[PDB]
């Protein structure tokens, strides 16, 4: 993701759930790219918890969306003098769209109670409407290309992340470890658990990660914290002596 | 830097199969596809095809639809070009280019073109064998003065010409080679010298032909 500021000055770059700033260290399961074209006034509709014509009839984002949106003006490539009618949207629908749903219905909208008989008529408007993009329109009406990136974070191998080199595997000592985006501290030892081939990491009664699978070799490693304890100081009065004893 | 290298020239017989290699360096091989284009001597460019490095999907031209094959090997990052039923019209220069028009992953069009090309591969077709060059001097008339050295039936095309080992380089004119109906080559070298030095100064024409290993040199004198 380091090479992304090499296009026209982006007008919208908003990222939810992950900070874009030099944070290509996270490993994801899969990535989804959703590309479309809208007008400038509709760009604000592409966000969690936003209501609008495009939001409920063309593209709805979840309230817990984890990912980002990049929208940039594309007037020089999608504006024609005669008018570009190749970009269409949906304005009439019976019910609002569910998140990440595609609607390609061409049926005539039954605005009234009488049937439309499959032809244009009274109380029968075509669901598809044309943007009619031209360079002479306003800033809000100018065409804009929008790409939405959705990241998947599950208990999966998660084989999509940045260029970070791996090191050797060392055991039987308290070290800092980064197992495929999962950071921690402790000693890793050979584990005697009967992991199943579809399983990745284990868990304990205290609901914490206590076992991992090496993403290079089919080996299960138990994770334990390094040595810990409390210290007590036994002393007589300072009015008597300066000698002390220590209890671990 | 991005670098491309190709194979050598071929003098194979008509009807055989041509095999070309395109080796890439300094750029991710899988991320980019490979385009094969040709340029005929005396003509312009003529694109043939495109090959994707991610899954091997290819796109051929309708003119060579039944003769062209492209493959890729990611171990050595080498593209392999195999053309069957070679004809006499295939004598041209072949160019291997990095494709930035169609994406290798999704197969859709992209804003760009061939931004990096190879060194070019010469393909020559002729149903004939090699032969040592035949050299003939051309003397000035009895009446600046001019003279020359004409070479005929030298095969293949690669041949070098020298006049006194570069002492008189300024004044040597070498016309482009011309092919006759017998599949044999022709070339000429022309030297212009002052008319006061025809009988004193020495002029030698030397023709070097590597495949036949000849360094034949002749003195050129007025007649």
């Amino acid at each position: 993701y380091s090479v992304l500021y090499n296009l026209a000055p982006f007008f919208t770059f908003k990222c939810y759930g992950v900070s874009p700033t030099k944070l290509n260290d996270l490993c994801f399961t899969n990535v989804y790219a959703d590309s479309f074209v809208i007008r400038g006034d509709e760009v604000r509709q592409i966000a969690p918890g936003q209501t609008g014509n495009i939001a409920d009839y063309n593209y709805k984002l979840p309230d817990d969306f984890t990912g980002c949106v990049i929208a940039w003006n594309s007037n020089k490539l999608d504006s024609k003098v005669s008018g570009n009618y190749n970009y269409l949207y949906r304005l009439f629908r019976k019910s609002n769209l569910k998140p990440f749903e595609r609607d390609i219905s061409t049926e005539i909208y039954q605005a009234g109670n009488k049937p439309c008989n499959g032809v244009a008529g009274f109380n029968c408007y075509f669901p598809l409407r044309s943007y009619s993009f031209r360079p002479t329109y306003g800033v809000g009406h100018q065409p804009y290309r929008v790409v939405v990136l959705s990241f998947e974070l599950l208990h999966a191998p998660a084989t999509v992340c940045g260029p970070k080199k791996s090191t050797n595997l060392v055991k039987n000592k308290c070290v800092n470890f980064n197992f495929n985006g999962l950071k921690g501290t402790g000693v890793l030892t050979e584990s005697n658990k009967k992991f199943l081939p579809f399983q990745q990491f284990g868990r304990d009664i205290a609901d914490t990660t206590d076992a991992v699978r090496d993403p290079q070799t089919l080996e299960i490693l138990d994770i334990t914290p390094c040595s810990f304890g409390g210290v007590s100081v036994i002393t007589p009065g300072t009015n008597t002596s300066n000698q002390v004893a220590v209890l671990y | 830097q991005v670098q491309l290298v190709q194979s050598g020239a071929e003098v194979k017989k008509p009807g055989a199969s041509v095999k070309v290699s395109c080796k890439a360096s300094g750029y991710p091989f899988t991320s980019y596809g490979i385009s094969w284009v040709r340029q005929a001597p005396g003509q312009g460019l003529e694109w043939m095809g495109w090959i994707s490095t991610y899954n091997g999907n290819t796109n051929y031209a309708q003119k060579f639809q039944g003769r062209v094959t492209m493959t890729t090997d990611t171990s050595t990052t080498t593209g392999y070009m195999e053309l069957r039923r070679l004809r006499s019209d295939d004598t041209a220069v072949y160019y291997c280019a990095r494709d930035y028009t169609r994406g290798a992953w999704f197969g859709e069009s992209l804003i760009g073109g061939f931004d990096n090309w190879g060194q070019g591969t010469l393909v020559t077709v002729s149903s004939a064998s090699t032969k040592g060059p035949s050299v003939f001097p051309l003397a000035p008339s009895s009446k600046t003065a001019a003279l020359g050295c004409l070479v005929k039936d030298y095969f293949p095309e690669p041949v070098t010409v020298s006049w006194n080992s570069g002492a008189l380089t300024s004044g040597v004119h070498t016309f482009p080679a011309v092919l006759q109906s017998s599949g044999l080559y022709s070339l000429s070298s022309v030297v212009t010298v002052p008319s006061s030095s025809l009988g004193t100064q020495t002029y030698i024409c030397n023709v070097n032909h590597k495949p036949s290993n000849t360094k034949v040199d002749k003195k050129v004198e007025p007649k």
Binding site: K193, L196, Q200 | -
Partner: protein, 312 residues
Amino acid sequence: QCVNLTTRTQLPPAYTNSFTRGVYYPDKVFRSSVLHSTQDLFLPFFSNVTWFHVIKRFDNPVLPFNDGVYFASIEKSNIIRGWIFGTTLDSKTQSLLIVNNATNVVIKVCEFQFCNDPFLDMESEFRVYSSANNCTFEYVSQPFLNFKNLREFVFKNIDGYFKIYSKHTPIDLPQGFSALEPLVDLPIGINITRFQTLLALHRSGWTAGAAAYYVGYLQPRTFLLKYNENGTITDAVDCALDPLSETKCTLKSFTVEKGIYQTSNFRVQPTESIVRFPNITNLCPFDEVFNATRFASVYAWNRKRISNCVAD
């Protein structure tokens, strides 16, 4: 090419009891010696499941594909082969299909043109479809494979992902517990509502062997699963079956001592809905503006202000 055959034995399908079947691992996290409560799509305990018997008996109706499906097969000599999923089952929409014809499992997600009875019958007769439009995804791998074969499968379609859990065992569904380990996960994104089973007849004119397949529907509910020392699910409790199971889930244990326990809260829900608004009174003078007898010219357009009324 299609085969015409309507020798089906028209009879109502049987109904049977799914006691404690349809339990699958809900996640890839390893656990051991712990009781875990999870809310997910499961087959309810002691449920009504439809039973189809195939022997002539040849019934392959297209069944619905609500939020999940539990498929069971009591089989010998591998009569049941594969499945097809879709909504329209034509080229209008997307179609998904799986074949396991004792060679290798093949998954095909494209546009089809099925006949009125897609099925199969050495093996040299494939009469399922006649068209092949654009394609989306493909998958090839190892085959999934008194009656002695019992095969259990769970099919889910969540967020455009097709999840298939499977289990095989040697042998009215038998009473017992057997968890279903996950097998396949596919990023398809297909609108599935209706589905069909795939049979392979034994031509002699054919005589299909005896086989049985059961279908049940999944529902969202909370379960309490028990793991032994090894990471295997050995017992489960459905927290919505009866008051005793709900008490067990509340106490987070499989045994209950004598006493009285405050289990939950009960409440009733509304049936209808009503809306009351004051009235439609002193409507705005829109009729006066629209139905004026004489209209002014364009240069001298009549301008009026309307306020403090109902804009009908």
